[PDB]
Amino acid sequence: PQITLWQRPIVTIKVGGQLREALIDTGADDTILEEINLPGRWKPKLIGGIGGFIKVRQYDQIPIEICGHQAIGTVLVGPTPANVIGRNMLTQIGCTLNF
């Protein structure tokens, strides 16, 4: 697909046998989802906060589907104002910026 930026670029994703809304965020290194039970091993990770750190669970090599494109990558799970698809996942689906 070609997505324009007049609205927030919010897409339907498939992850952990669920459907989620997530923002395509070229400003985010990492992919973070609100609380979801993901399979496999996780390790704790500290991400940056309004005067402090947030502890999240890091799952490696998680299958996602973004507008029908599969992508394996790291997903962080914990407190987030939205599901965010960050650059680690956008590279996997061949997402570029174009003008």
Place this chain on the structure above:
Amino acid sequence: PQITLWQRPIVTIKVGGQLREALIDTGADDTILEEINLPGRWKPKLIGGIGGFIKVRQYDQIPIEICGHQAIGTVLVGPTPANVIGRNMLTQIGCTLNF
């Protein structure tokens, strides 16, 4: 240009007679620069924060240049971890996401 997302999409911009580095951020509604003297009238604006609001100065209809494309739009000036080019400016240069 076509910009891939293996690295942060940081571009050279021209604004207020200065050169700045800024992140292309599809996750940002608005364009925010670190302290710069911009011409014209500004009004105060509250944007969201780690447990609170940040007061910034809103300049309307400011010329920018991103990789040689001119774009008029709103620029916010105040405390920001980086220059951020948000969607209000990316639409003006015809920036899309593509995969």
